[PDB]
Amino acid sequence: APPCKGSYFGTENLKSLVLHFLQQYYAIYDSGDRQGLLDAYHDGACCSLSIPFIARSSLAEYFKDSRNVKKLKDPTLRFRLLKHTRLNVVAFLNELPKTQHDVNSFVVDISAQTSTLLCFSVNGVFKEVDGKSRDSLRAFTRTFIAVPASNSGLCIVNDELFVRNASSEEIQRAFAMPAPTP
């Protein structure tokens, strides 16, 4: 059984590329207004959110736009839960709880790559900075697939975000700040 490793980038070139993208992306994401993301998404980009189907803070805020094809069967309801076009994509994102991610603790896997495609997954944690779940720690995996951007950047054409509650194991770790010992 291969030994579980962290982030996988393949080339330092894509590492710096992707990591840079995430810095800019989440700088805007946690800013208070995610509108600046309209430049990160393609005109006909897609976005959808999913949460665990299964007493920590509530995810009721994500339940409304939760897309689970395994559980939800109606083709028309399936279709509506999928945000299409950057306008709808970003309009939706701006409705989500304000956030503050731990970008530098992100574990990234670049799984696919061609001259026009770059698929990669992001795993990490983020605090909700307000609302009824303020100070709560969420965990998430987000998959983007990008096409080359006119500026050596990335244009996200596909974005699937999975939001969950950090497990007691993760929380313990994230918040630990013990005195140094030999």
């Binding site: 949460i51 897309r67 395994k70 279709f79 999928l82 495609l117 997954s121 096409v147 699937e160």
Partner: protein, 136 residues
């Protein structure tokens, strides 16, 4: 061509493929490697396994598995990404117990590519990614 129709086909193929994928994974492991393309790759918990052959090998070395899929979402990949190629993005979430290790939750995503033929279009994984929520 209608966008809604690509969404419905994505749901259909994801719905369908997934069910096969885990049944094959759990009960016919020796077959799971044919649901992949020859050039396909897989990023298993930060580990990169290369090619249809290494994938076949990789699944054999893994322990008897037992999956339970609770979450599935999918989307039709934009054509600027896969020019002239019909692909679907599928993200899965469930649990899994491997022989000799506690049961844990996982997240996995892969891109399915449509191969046209006589009878029916067939979907194969072109790129795969799997990571334990607690690999830590």
């Amino acid at each position: 061509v209608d966008f809604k129709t690509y969404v419905d086909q994505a749901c259909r193929a994801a719905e369908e493929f997934v069910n096969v994928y885990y049944t094959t994974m759990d009960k016919r492991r020796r077959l799971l490697s044919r649901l992949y393309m020859g050039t396909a790759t897989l990023v298993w918990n930060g580990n990169a396994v290369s090619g249809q052959e290494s994938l076949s090998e990789f699944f054999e070395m893994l322990p008897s598995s037992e999956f339970q899929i609770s979450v599935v979402d999918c989307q039709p990949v934009h054509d600027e990404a896969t020019p002239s190629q019909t692909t679907v993005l599928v993200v899965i979430c469930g649990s899994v117990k491997f022989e000799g290790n506690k049961q844990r939750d996982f997240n996995q995503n892969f891109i399915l590519t449509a191969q046209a033929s006589p009878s029916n279009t067939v979907w194969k994984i072109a790129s795969d990614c799997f990571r334990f929520q607690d690999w830590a």
